[PDB]
Symmetry: none
Subunit: 240 residues, 6 copies
């Protein structure tokens, strides 16, 4: 339960696997797994996969593709068509599960195609970090120990959560929500939700940021209206 002991448990696991395919999102967790896998197995035994999809931002895709190459890995993008599944398209309350099936099936296929022994992710499918009992504390210490300083500081969540259960997702309403959230982040609010209620936009901010938001009220109102919302509102209860 020392860090040196957990790092060794991780090393021993990667060595036994020989070849791996890493589901790589660009956060600090998957960043740590990919770097360790490269160090222990070498570039030509590691394949980093970054999923491109409608449910997540193109900025997160382009950032993870760039970061994985930056760590010295063979990186491959793959495009998932989440809305082709009827459960996801109609935002069923179990649609999270159908999306994971699509995801891991694709990476399972890529991994069997390239001869990998397992698909790896960054939980703290094999979650080696979790298996070695890494906490966020340990992930921070080891990443700094390897010289890592660059990763996506905001981990994102599926845009489906912005729509009520049963609401049909469309390319247009997803783009409208993602454009609104991107604008709000560019103003200094990295944690924000633009909940979609047809003609009404309902913005969720952490309550301690709401006073800071006041200077932007008018600009946000006009911008989100130009994106197609008729009414632009701020939820009084805050984020969650």
């Amino acid at each position: 339960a020392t860090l040196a002991t957990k790092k060794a448990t991780l090393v021993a696991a990667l060595k036994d696997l020989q070849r791996v395919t890493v589901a790589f999102s660009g956060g600090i967790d998957s960043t740590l797994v990919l770097k360790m896998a490269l160090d222990v197995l070498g570039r030509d035994n590691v394949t980093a996969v970054v999923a491109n999809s409608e449910l997540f931002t193109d900025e997160e895709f382009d950032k993870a593709m760039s970061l994985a190459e930056e760590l010295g890995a063979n990186v491959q993008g793959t495009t998932l068509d989440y809305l082709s599944d009827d459960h996801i398209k109609n935002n069923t309350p179990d649609s999270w599960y159908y999306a994971k099936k699509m995801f891991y099936s694709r990476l399972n296929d890529i991994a069997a195609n390239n001869g990998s022994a397992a698909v790896l992710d960054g939980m703290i499918a094999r979650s080696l970090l979790q298996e070695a009992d890494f906490f966020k504390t340990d992930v921070r210490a080891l990443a700094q120990e390897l010289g890592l300083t660059n990763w996506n500081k905001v981990a994102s969540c599926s845009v489906s959560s912005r729509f009520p259960y049963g609401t049909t997702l469309t390319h247009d309403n997803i783009a409208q929500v993602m454009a609104a959230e991107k604008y709000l982040r560019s103003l200094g609010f990295p944690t924000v939700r633009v909940r979609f209620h047809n003609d009404i936009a309902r913005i969720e901010l952490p309550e301690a940021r709401i006073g800071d938001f006041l200077v932007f009220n008018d600009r946000v109102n006009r911008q989100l209206q130009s994106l197609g919302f008729r009414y632009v509102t701020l939820d009084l209860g805050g984020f969650r």
Copy 2:
């Protein structure tokens, strides 16, 4: 011309009518007409009528009844059935016409039965069955304030009142339940110190409009307002970033 000329115009018009019924809302315009009617014709020749209805608050009705009494008038409450008309209940842009028709129809019946020569309302500069003497005498808001002060009037409702129908989208059917929900929500917001407020009804969403200069003061109340309006039946309680109108 001058305020004295406009007031003299108003006096001559009242003397010519001799006996009037005054539609009294409690605002400054309606307070000025009622007081001038009383000052020129006397209590026995003026009837003050305050309309009670589902579209306006009980608070505003109670305030108007006491102020009319305070002014020296013999006052009469009357209750209107706006929702009994299908045009008003279904909330179209034509609801206004049917509301005015019912209002003036009720006032004319009162006026017919007490022998008044006209129904007077408080419309100012900027209905065929009523006389708007301030408008005929070319009173602007500024002349109303000046003559009110000269007469020593100080007690009126200072916040403009508006039919609760404006809180529901056109084509939405008004119900006793959703009206009460909006009324209770706005009453709570006024009790916190926001006399000018709208709770716009969007089914499970409340969209609160405040004057933008007040939005910064509202932050200390977010959580209490959120919880209170949820207990009134809204699922989501929101602040419109554009502010009041």
Copy 3:
């Protein structure tokens, strides 16, 4: 009875007294009494009296003095030494009765020396009042607050002190002994806070702690003043300067 009858009752009562001393606070009730006394008896036969004391602000005193003069009354200030009464100094629930008793006793002395037939106050539809023989003509004529407002409108009165102020003793817990120093400390603190744009404020005294009560809707506006209020009230002697998260009262 009609408002015209109540006014007539008040006129006849004033005519019968012929010369009066009016306890004037600046509120709408004493303004109406003072204005009716002037209209019926003439400025030469009415004296308006405003009490100054340690328990109320100088600003309320000066405003009442100006309002009486603007109404056309000869006005006289008188200063009461409320802290000389131990019932008041010890801040008990009956302190206000002894304050009232000292007030009306001073008014009787003034009235005796100027030939007034009665002391009038602004009470509407009280033991210290009756013990001193002072007269509440609005109460005797059946004026309620709506009648007061109706007659004030008819007389064209539009200016009066809208906030009936409150004795500074409410800033100290019952049983806490009032002193010249702790009163002055609280009074100066509230005076500074009003000067910043907060007319409704309390500085509650908790020895080395000042606990400021503001209307909650004003608390956000206060932020720009935190450090100045902190240092200003510490220089008045408080060790800690705090804002009550619950707001006013």
Copy 4:
């Protein structure tokens, strides 16, 4: 002494003059002199003059004109060209004096041409502007304080009544028709947002906005609109003075003194 004694002094002075021209600003003081002149001398023997100029708002002028009309006085508007005087155009510290000189010179010309025996005003670098012009301040000669003005106005039944734009420019800055218009439009816009007490001080390409400090937190919701509106009026930079309107007046005693020392 006595209000009655003071009112009588003012009455005797008016009777002795018989016909007067009154400088009328619409404030309570000039409202009182105008009403007393009318009551003692009659409408035919009083001329009220309201001055229009570039240094005050059209709103203020119209207000004064209608109030003089409301009191029942024959009223004459006259427009002054204050910027024709180099002290005013260059906004020197004695600019007020030369403005008064030009104002009283115009009133004297009106008074000479209508047969008035004096110019009256509402008062309570050389000779006094009035003394030089021969203007009379009857409320001052009768020792009226402001409470006396207020007392007599209620007694006479007066119930309705109402700063030069040059104060928005630094001394030595040249006033122009354009930059005056720019300052006045900026303040009118800020007042329309709900800030009745406001100054837009002109520092060439910078606007420096003074607000009462208790309003500054509420103002934040308007920052971007104010910035873009005042830039379209010609300012390059739009700023908020952190000291607020009448800086120092709300500071604690120690820092109030420090701000005095810095000035």
Copy 5:
């Protein structure tokens, strides 16, 4: 001179001591001493000691225990009974020193029994403060911690709960629990640096001034929550946490006069 020379002084001091016991609080200073001790002497010749007591939170103890383990140290918990000392129990102005004396007495007992040559603490510019002997200032501590790859330490300074009570007030489990629960609630709202000062029926909350404007949306919830914990009045100190450090020159001088008057 240079950081390298200061680090070299610290290395030489550790090698001469050979075996040491480290008073480990989890702050950045203690973290550096512990890490350097491990690198110079090895895991078998260093014992990290984390004190648990009623005057500090369980969260700070758990954080310190995990960080010492993560750095690779044999770590040992030890529990101090500060409240059995009358100066500490009655919170006299010298309470800090009787607490420190009891603390170092415990560390000496442990060090004597494990064969350590000294007790080390994290003090900077019979216990040894090697950072101070090597002329480390705060900026040198941060520079060397960064060079050593140290990332996890207590970003918010820990501090004994005694500082929340006036001198002469008797500490009890009830009023300590009341203060700790109030501060934990405020931390859960997003204010990691906070003090709830105890004044019998008054709670006086200190926040960094740059956070006070953000607190407004929580006023009513904080008021209710702290009243249910037993306070009658819940107040915000207008001077904030660490009053005066962010003031202009003049009023920083004034606030220091005020603070000195008590």
Copy 6:
């Protein structure tokens, strides 16, 4: 096209120079050059030079010196008198070039006097330099920002100036004359605001007016400090202290 080939080009370039003087700012780029120069040529053959001047803060000078020392380099400060150049003192739009010219001219003098074959800076793929003959080895080896980060990670570099500063000349309008006093005044004002918790700030100088630029999302936080900032910046010599309603870089 790979990181390994770019690093090799940079190594071979350094080996061919043998001896160098490194313009060291403390940012990640010049940190990478200084670390690669030390690793390839040895401490005795590298001189890190940090410029002290009126256009940058003393604190930034001190940080760069300590960062170079931490890397294990011989470092020397050099003091430039930028205000002696009339283009810089009168703050024309061309002042940024004359400052760079004076900088690279000084470094060439140091390089000539210590036997260096070149002056190196940290410019990457993303005018005064070329005219002075200074070499940007990261630019010549095709390093983009991501390549700089990749190699710093590989070398174990994790410490550098994360915020690159701007010459204080940017706080003055073109045509405004720089003086020792107004520069100091601007610097002390920005230092005070940073101490309040506003790391990104500019105090723009408009003679008797200070115009403070903050990120708009911080302006609400700022309110509690209005009066202290007003009085502090007045004690530094400004008559009026203002907040730009347009925010940072309005």
